[PDB]
Amino acid sequence: SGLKAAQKTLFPLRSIDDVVRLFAAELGREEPDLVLLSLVLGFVEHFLAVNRVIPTNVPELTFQPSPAPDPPGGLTYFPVADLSIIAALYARFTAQIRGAVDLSLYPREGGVSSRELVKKVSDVIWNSLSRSYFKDRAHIQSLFSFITGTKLDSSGVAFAVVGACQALGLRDVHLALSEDHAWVVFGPNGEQTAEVTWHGKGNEDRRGQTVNAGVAERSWLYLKGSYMRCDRKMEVAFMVCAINPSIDLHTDSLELLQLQQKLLWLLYDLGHLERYPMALGNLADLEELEPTPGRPDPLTLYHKGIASAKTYYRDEHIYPYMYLAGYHCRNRNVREALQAWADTATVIQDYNYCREDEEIYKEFFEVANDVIPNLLKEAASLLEAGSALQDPECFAHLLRFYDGICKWEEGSPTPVLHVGWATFLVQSLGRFEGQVRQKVRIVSGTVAGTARGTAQVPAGPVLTFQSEKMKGMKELLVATKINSSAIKLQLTASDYTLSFLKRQRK
């Protein structure tokens, strides 16, 4: 088809504000052009982060200078996204897709695409790209990468399928997002799902399949069915969060940061981040790096993220709580950090650890074994050298945190806790004096619910464990003497109920 005239006249883009304008315009439509926006984002990220050296051998390429930030001062050069280049890339991508699929062969009765169609488009992309199989590569998430070097990362593939479908007028094909995976949803009620990309290694054979098995097995990868079903607006939010300001391991592009930041505020003001917890979290991190005059504080944004997850996703997301806890950790608010992690543990306790949940495992491991120990160790110095370590609450949160992780392990095909965890649990316990640890009351319930007629409640922060392991050692944890050996042992390792339920009834 080509670019509409209203689209061609937004170019050239000479600044961060110009890019923001392109997005505003596109966000103003019923069907914002995902291909055009991704190409632009990839193009700009390429010269700002991937290869910053101004090519003097290339004339068509121009660079718009503007004042750098002060006090540093100087000049910063922005890569001018020329219409001739962007339109070329846009035509190339559109050509590949349109020529590859014959919409004549596909009868879409109603505004609904068939699974065969989606798999066809999926296949077109899959056979076009080339993976960086042996090497982790950054900046290959955009369609700019796809159409230029052919490279595409995991989630980049999923996005490309949706962009491709839109380029064919498949208005019902949307991106599905978990916290570490992406697929496609389509059809009536947008209730059909198709895997289009890979996760981990040796799992390419999953493409084409439905997502049910993943949802059913309760892996974190599929969020127990509470994953994100995007619309066009959220898909724009996705590609914006997908911007990677990293130039190297320890260096970031200021403009990519500012661009991402301004773009997320645009999306916020329009109400498109309402159902996007990680995006809210992303914005908070940026507001923490470079606060913007007049905008809500990070703490407020993180809480919006958790609110979104609770409202729209049955409070089944982990990261929103992880983000908050990270903030409190970075500012030495121990009680707050501990509480947020406790909350995080509470959400994960109802999942089942699978080999493809490695990403969220790493995070928990790092919290229990690195971040918490250091925080507790730090607090110990503030004590003896003249407090969290003297508050039964914080010790309860700690216990609740481990309880959830233990609960997570139950019913999981793969063991979670090992020697590496036990060592630090023991060390973390000790950091609390028996006097404090004993003020916490561990106990099971005796009576369910409360009566009324007024309200009658049947009978130190009382605590109740959900996991087998944590209550199996309720006594040890509270003793004045930490039985290091015992704890480390426990921390690692029938229609009865039905027929019983009858006996209570008959």
> What would the two tokens of residue 184 be?
């496609």
Count of C-beta atoms within a 10 Å radius of residue 96:
17
Q: Are 204 and 131 in contact (CB under 8 A)?
A: no
Sign of the C-alpha dihedral computed for residues 455, 456, 459 and 464 taken in this order: negative
Q: Are 257 and 290 in contact (CB under 8 A)?
A: yes
For 444, counting Cβ atoms within 10 Å of its Cβ (0-12 exposed, 13-18 middle, 19+ buried), the class is: exposed
* d(C-alpha 168, C-alpha 111), whole Å: 13
For residue 348, give the nearest of 445, 220, 177 by alpha carbon: 220
* d(C-alpha 401, C-alpha 282), whole Å: 24
Count of C-beta atoms within a 10 Å radius of residue 10:
21
Sign of the C-alpha dihedral computed for residues 111, 112, 116 and 119 taken in this order: positive
Count of C-beta atoms within a 10 Å radius of residue 462:
11
Q: Are 27 and 233 in contact (CB under 8 A)?
A: yes
Number of structural domains the chain divides into: 1
Q: Count helices and strands (H / E) in the chain.
A: 23, 8
Count of C-beta atoms within a 10 Å radius of residue 331:
13
Q: How do beta strands 174-177 and 182-186 pair?
A: antiparallel
* d(C-alpha 194, C-alpha 207), whole Å: 7
For residue 54, is it left (φ>0), alpha (ψ between -120 and 50) or beta? beta
Q: Are 318 and 281 in contact (CB under 8 A)?
A: no
* d(C-alpha 412, C-alpha 215), whole Å: 14
Give Cα separations from 106 to 110, 115, 123, 196 (angstroms): 12, 10, 15, 19
Q: Are 398 and 373 in contact (CB under 8 A)?
A: no
With a CB cutoff of 8 Å and minimum separation 6, the contacts of 357 are: 180, 219, 220, 221, 351
What DSSP string runs through 24-53? HHHHTSSS--HHHHHHHHHHHHIIIII--S
Q: Are 395 and 335 in contact (CB under 8 A)?
A: no
C-to-N gaps above 2.5 Å in the chain, after residues: 386, 453, 459, 493
Q: Are 267 and 240 in contact (CB under 8 A)?
A: yes
Half-sphere exposure of 377 (CA within 13 A, CB side): 11
Count of C-beta atoms within a 10 Å radius of residue 93:
23
Q: DSSP H helical segments within 152-250, as ranges?
A: 154-166, 212-216, 232-241
Q: What is the dihedral of CA 369, 371, 375, 381, to 10 degrees?
A: 60
Q: Are 432 and 395 in contact (CB under 8 A)?
A: yes
Q: Which amino acid is at 287?
A: E
Residue 1, strand partner residues:
none
Give Cα separations from 500 to 55, 445, 468, 494, 505 (angstroms): 78, 19, 21, 11, 9
Count of C-beta atoms within a 10 Å radius of residue 151:
16
Residue 451, strand partner residues:
456
**Which helix (DSSP H) or strand (DSSP E) does residue 66 occupy?**
strand 63-67
* d(C-alpha 489, C-alpha 336), whole Å: 30
Q: Are 3 and 36 in contact (CB under 8 A)?
A: yes
Give backbone dihedrals phi and psi of 78, rounded to 5 degrees, phi first: -105, 135
* d(C-alpha 253, C-alpha 107), whole Å: 47
For 412, counting Cβ atoms within 10 Å of its Cβ (0-12 exposed, 13-18 middle, 19+ buried), the class is: middle
Give backbone dihedrals phi and psi of 388, rounded to 5 degrees, phi first: -60, -45
* d(C-alpha 30, C-alpha 88), whole Å: 24
CA angle, corner 441, sides to 438 and 444, nearest 5? 145
With a CB cutoff of 8 Å and minimum separation 6, the contacts of 35 are: 90, 93, 94, 143, 163, 166, 167
> What would the two tokens of residue 179 be?
């916290």
Q: Are 111 and 171 in contact (CB under 8 A)?
A: yes
* d(C-alpha 307, C-alpha 377), whole Å: 32
Resolution in angstrom units? 2.5
* d(C-alpha 380, C-alpha 374), whole Å: 10
Q: How do beta strands 455-456 and 75-79 pair?
A: unpaired
Give the 3-state secondary structure of residue 81.
strand
- The DSSP letter of residue 178 is -
Q: Which domain holds residue 50?
A: 1-506
Q: Tokens 């329009």 belong to which residue?
A: 270
Q: How do beta strands 75-79 and 63-67 pair?
A: antiparallel
Give the 3-state secondary structure of residue 63.
strand
Q: Are 273 and 267 in contact (CB under 8 A)?
A: yes
Q: Are 37 and 22 in contact (CB under 8 A)?
A: yes
> What would the two tokens of residue 293 be?
């005059």
SS3 letters for 420-475? HHHHHHHHHHHCCCHHHHCCCCECCCCCCCCEECCEECCCCCCECCCCHHHHHCHH
Q: What is the dihedral of CA 375, 376, 377, 378, to 10 degrees?
A: 50
Give Cα separations from 246 to 48, 70, 149, 188, 249 (angstroms): 10, 22, 19, 40, 7
> What would the two tokens of residue 255 be?
């403009």
* d(C-alpha 197, C-alpha 14), whole Å: 35
Q: Are 478 and 440 in contact (CB under 8 A)?
A: yes
What DSSP string runs through 222-238? GGGG--EE--HHHHHHH
CA angle, corner 375, sides to 369 and 379, nearest 5? 140
* d(C-alpha 385, C-alpha 416), whole Å: 37
> What would the two tokens of residue 88 be?
């070329």
* d(C-alpha 469, C-alpha 463), whole Å: 15
- Contacts of 428-433 spanning 24+ positions with Cβ under 8 A: 428/368, 428/372, 428/373, 428/376, 428/398, 429/398, 429/477, 429/482, 429/487, 430/482, 431/376, 431/377, 431/379, 431/380, 431/389, 432/389, 432/395, 432/398, 433/389, 433/390
Q: Are 75 and 66 in contact (CB under 8 A)?
A: yes
Give Cα separations from 314 to 235, 275, 310, 317 (angstroms): 21, 12, 5, 8
For residue 32, give the nearest of 43, 45, 22 by alpha carbon: 22
> What would the two tokens of residue 116 be?
């065969």
- The DSSP letter of residue 368 is I
* d(C-alpha 235, C-alpha 227), whole Å: 14
Q: Are 211 and 195 in contact (CB under 8 A)?
A: yes
